[model samples]
Target: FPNWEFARMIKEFRATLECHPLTMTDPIEEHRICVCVRKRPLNKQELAKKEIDVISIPSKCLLLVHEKVDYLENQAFCFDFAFDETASNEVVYRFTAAPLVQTIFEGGKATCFAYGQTGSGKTHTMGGDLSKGIYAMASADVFLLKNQPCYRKLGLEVYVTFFEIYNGKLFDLLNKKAKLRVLEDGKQQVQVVGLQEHLVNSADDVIKMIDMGSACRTNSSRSHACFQIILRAKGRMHGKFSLVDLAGNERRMEGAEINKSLLALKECIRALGQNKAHTPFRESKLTQVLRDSFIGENSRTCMIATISPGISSCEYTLNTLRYADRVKEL
Candidate 1:
């Protein structure tokens, strides 16, 4: 026997968690079907014979990422793949990929990450084109950089901090502290390292930060180092974290040449998915910096998983799918 007024009050007062799984009006499978028998021209029976699948994300998603390869010779390097830019174009299909993830956060946190095999496009997307990659989305005062709104012109004070995770140790990338090392905090979910925080008044500032960090990152046969750039604003009550994880080298056919870091990266991502509390994030500098964001509560998270349709990549694709499924739960 519950009091009606009290019940109504309780109903109104109870905490609520309303989740909208990132939905798609047109999924890849649908895309496949839509184009299946068109120019590529497959018969109805043939189209029906093709297997198609869809990856799901929670609704009100803030960031939608695409994983692709920046091929260097026959070797594939993972990078964040956006269609040129997130500007108006059909390329949005290749860039944002998923539906637009525009959300507002009120005294809360949101997170997203990019994951894939070595040599995939994780690094390039996470960090950007080491060779003059334009962070067109993050430009400061460029009121119309690529026809996008300029934060500086809007009276927005954008401060950027860049860092990297190497062999499980954190290193700053924008200042003298760029060399300082910090271990990923296991007790908590996010790791904090020191980097030069810049009060950017123009898009030019963001570009400089990108180039500066790229110069500080490490590159080798095994792994291409990446930057974790965080944009913090004062008056804005929301934060969007986008991760551009570089692809890792998955094969050891060459033996212990340069695959050490790539192998270590594998171990770290595995631990992250399993929620291994004691898992050694110190395995590499990158994982340590992401420790907190990966495991923290109230993170608005997304993953841009890139996969190839080639038979050579079957194993890699399967592995990517397994991880993506795990992320759906995380």
Candidate 2:
């Protein structure tokens, strides 16, 4: 490409680039969705290859991607938030999970999920270890709030439910040999028939139940996992928090069910982000179950897309970043 044409292309790209709004103060506002991107640190294997990192965050809301051969050949994207590979677990929870919990506390539904390719640290970021994962940290704080005098005065009752969508079928992780069914009620509310819910009085209790459910979770790579905690007050449902760990993006190694569910989920998100008149909520079982999370008027949704910071993973990283970009449009 000639210099003038290259310059023209860059100018056109700049003209088309839409930056995300910097402030995220109103998490519980109707139809609000925050999409964040987190690039994980390069592992030992990645460092051994001497592959230069092709991605950089020049600002908190923007990411810069450069070509391997030509540094000038680059792309930039704006997201609600961006975290580098070295960001600690605490940092992630504070900005991402805290707001979701706040939304739940204020009688609104919130959903958070991790997305990336297999081995790209989606599971590690969301459900890495019992104590270090976002699920544990968020539940602990929620229980603390529930035990407080003010919260107790409001008569809040908290319940935890853990289930997995394996091969597009729901399984009760906390129940014994129980398979659940997903259906939409007459009022268009999605219901998980026969799903078990455990009353959790303390953070420790919540963690214990999660650990127990983990044992029952299908030990298969082609399954999607969802852990939900419902908060009820005044004898009615007040709010709910859901943590979904979707299957990795390596579709060739997985089954059609996994890809189909993911595709459906993505389509719903894209539609929601674009403010389409009719969002396809019933396209997949997973989306049907999560329809409330996405369609509810007072719901807050956030997605953290994890990525590898290595030259070899440039393609996959871009793919995930583009996915996050679409969600950020919401």
Candidate 3:
């Protein structure tokens, strides 16, 4: 969490090559907070709707989403990267969260978020069969890099914190879905009682823990599940990374508003991007839990906006693109 209690827990490595050279020199920092979009292949039900795909990728970073009223025109948005249906989950992870893994190893804070409509491929990207999920793939890299001789001397140990936010409440996904309460310590630390943190040695171990949490939750697609990977050395925290599968974009309030977390998250990120003096992190549990990822001096954040290709999803997908565009435009 990089709280004041853990000050100076991470030592600066004399040689950056101590970690993977591939990520060591990567220009991931070029984007303060990288924003990317992925448009999924139309499903069978969507194919039966008798409508063609409304979304098109014009370039690597440009996405054009079409609408009916704008038949003679379209809305185009440019992000860090725009992945089409052909881009596999592996490719998405390699460019998006993989570099964030390296950030965690170097004692920095990082986060990856998947935002989309309910039926889109949000779960498929951040969590799923475990083999192809972005979080799982990141764990494999962490396990491999942490065991290297150079990092071994750092005495890094991996631990995971699995939890979810629903209706502005915290629940421990790793603790039989127990409802957790937020408590504050004197020096700006928030605690979720009954939240379980499991020590993991390998990628498979992390996957097993996630699978257990997966079994305890229902309506998982509508809630915000935050899976955190922390690297610890000598009891003090070194680095932390978070994978947040956000609530569905179409979530409804009494009126046109969507999920509280969804709105709050956008506001928080927009503030960070614009360098606002005060961010509304406490507005939602989702943003409160991600304070480190935004407030840290060496923090990194990535957003993967998923879009559906069905004809009916034309407007919905545009709203998503607009939402992503709004967050990135700041």
Candidate 4:
């Protein structure tokens, strides 16, 4: 995904692009990530080959220009936030500050989840590693924003629900006995219970849960259950979510088991893209739990799809782009 051509392609559909590379944060730096919207129309033949519905460029992209954001902000990096009434429903994604996260914390009821391939910064961003002096760091910029004395601490109540999908199956990161069920709440849905929901007053409380999630995950020499973790917040002005990570594509031979899992994940994603999921969440626990955000009637949602750029990962890179393209369709 690091190739100029592929990255350029992303910049094309994106309306308000913002790029933050590994701890690099600043509004100006984010502005540089924005790419020019191309005027070229999709040829019918090309559209059929790629399985994309031909539409106007702006119609295909969502635009959201933030007035301000804080460390509580998660799900900040987005592909397109604008909505075309005929194409999709209203998508409301909030950017929060970390310390401010406490301010918006609801009475322990809100849902948030992370999505992206493994090794793309999921664990680092959400699952902070204390060993690094910084625990699992999220894209939230509240810590840095708080430098201004005018912003007062909002001692808001906060709750978090963290879970992981391992090899097509969902696991409760906080509770091992956590059960998962595919439900249809008017919209296709995946339901999981026993997900550890913690009420915290300080950043330390949230960190403890992150550590618990990291330690509870399943991993082996053949594969790592490096699924995305979702953090839903409540007691705030609006619902907020953070996608911690997505399962990275693994080689079939290098890790046959892991490879098969990735394949299923890809199929599920494809189904969502095609709008063909009748009981889409039934495909996997991961899909089910994320049912509301992806297809249900939710007010806010965020999706982060990570990519690797090495030439060695060309095929994978292309596949990643295709997935992003499908998401663009949704």
Candidate 5:
């Protein structure tokens, strides 16, 4: 909720803080849930306004990732990547969402989601001030991917839709807050229904659309927004790539109903990861669309859990850790 003190403690500690050797050398694992935790560099504003920084880091920054499918232990949870100030743009995308681009091209569904508390670096991680959003990065890579082997069939076509959930109502951001609804078929597939779709021929087109879609958003922490690119090829439904900037998971009073979808999303991820008989997809509106975009058989999701480096943010930090940890159902 607030920022820090003990500024001197951090000042001297800065000398000891070395760049954590990142683990980006390994081949992408086919079955990993692809979760990561990245620390954002502390800013002067945070130091002056927040509390003392309080994360017990490893001697040198290193990947604290654990990968598990069969073994579900309690303490040693699993995550594919971990970095402090994983600031380099495309590299983070290359390791995180970039690896999943192939899934969309191959007619599979995917997601690159940012999950965290208010101002816990989620906004910076998903979309930086320096023209780097995982969605924007994905758009660039996806357009280029057409020239690859996957173009062996019908020419690819890309269509996008932008929508946000505000105060429990679905608003199509691309349509100037025009209200929207959901539709589900007998087969249980989720459809955007009346949402407007834009045909984008180039990366710049998609990127601009994304920028405009997110531009006039409501309160950053109160509205849940998603940017989707559904690939169409060979006269058939291809794949869907969705990037969501989830509402602040940290929630209260009137917030009880508003946070319902976030809670449902948490449950859905947990159930899906564990191969549960029934995911709580119908439990909330966000999950309804999310479950449909996620083709359970072959969909992959990547989560970037952003946590702050201060005492006041510890609970939010821990809460986020817990949420992401179970994405692997660990």
Candidate 6:
């Protein structure tokens, strides 16, 4: 959905703060798209402002909020899982990204991406300082799995590709920031041309590639950094694992393009959740590069929607939760 469409839906949602109507009747299949919400801890700036925290977690599936305008008015929404500000990165990995590794090991595609507004801790949740986030954690797990006798006997080789989608173009982060193209091959599978792929046999190798890619990423707020790992056996692709750190969707003048890409990605996920045959993957270059991740029947998707608990961030928090609810219906 574009600006006007999302605005209309947002207007309707604010009246009740309930699940989006489109999601009420469309129950997403189990384990297809696991939408989780994570509330980041208040930082020093927020503490200085004395902003009250409105997010609460009464249950793993519920996120309760106390409206700032009216203290007595409260709203609760259900999610696949909800994490409070105190939740640790290790815990988040166990609940969200770890299972995706198992899915890929079983020859299924899997993807995990962080989504939220600006300053909502998307990078912290996906790739924090010193490689302490989901990207590093998931990479370590996959390396350990590959070292196992069972996996080693299968002769599985792991390859990693890192890139960024800025504005509407793709950049190869590992190859000196070279521009890349998203093309559909003869078999209709989407491919990234001119992208460098590195073979990894250890966790250190994976982390090194990640660090290099992070350094090459555009410094602007409009770029989306994508990390992809491919598990191949016998010269054929077995499974694909993607970890994406998406650009934030804050309501700012400069974030319009960011929201456009994010909205298209959401629409694709929404279509997948609803089991619709037609998925709009071509709507943006970001979606085109990730076409395989969402198209396969056995692919598993997980979305970690980050949020701020501060009262000032209420509007953005509500919008993120609403989007997560729509993706994780039923």
lDDT of all predictions = 0.39, 0.74, 0.77, 0.37, 0.70, 0.79
lDDT of 6 by residue, 81-150 (tens): 7777767787777778888897888898898989988888888888885538898899899988888888
Per-residue error for 207 in candidate 4, Å, reads 0.5
What's model 3's lDDT at 60?
A: 67
Better of 3 and 4 by lDDT: 3
Candidates sorted on TM-score, descending:
6, 3, 5, 2, 1, 4
Q: What is the Cα root-mean-square deviation between model 2 and the actual structure?
A: 6.0
- The full ranking of all candidates by lDDT, starting with the best, is 6, 3, 2, 5, 1, 4
User: Cα lDDT of model 1 overall?
Assistant: 0.39
Kindly provide the TM-score of model 2 when superposed on the true structure, using C-alpha atoms: 0.84
On lDDT, the leading prediction is 6
Reference-based lDDT, residue 290, model 2 = 84
lDDT (Cα) of model 5: 0.70
TM-score of each: 0.50, 0.84, 0.86, 0.48, 0.84, 0.87
lDDT of 2 by residue, 1-330 (tens): 322243344445556756443233434223367777887777787667655566666556687775544324787887777777666666677678776786787888888888888777776776654446787888988987777776768788889888888776888888864788888888778889898668888888977887787677665456777889899886588899999888776553446877677678777776666656566778788889988777655677778888776767778888787777766553
lDDT measured at residue 241 in model 5 versus the true structure, 0 to 100 = 85
The better-scoring model by TM-score among 3 and 5 is: 3
Question: Residue 158 lDDT in model 3?
Answer: 94
For TM-score, the strongest prediction is 6
**For model 1, how does the per-residue alpha-carbon lDDT over 1-330 read when each residue is reduced to its tens digit?**
222243233233222424343223434321100000000112355335442111112122211221223211121222222121112212222234122122112222223344555544454444444332323342321223213443433343445666554443456667743566463344545535455556665567677777776677664323334433333445552343333444353441442422444344445445545555555555555555544443433433334554433324446655665544443332
Which regions of candidate 1 are displaced past 4 Å? 1-107, 127-135, 138-156, 183-193, 220-242, 247-288, 291-298
**Per-residue lDDT of 66-118 in model 3, one digit per residue for the tens?**
54542224567988888888878887887799888888888898889999898
1 or 2, greater by lDDT: 2
Angstrom error of the Cα, residue 102, model 3: value is 0.8
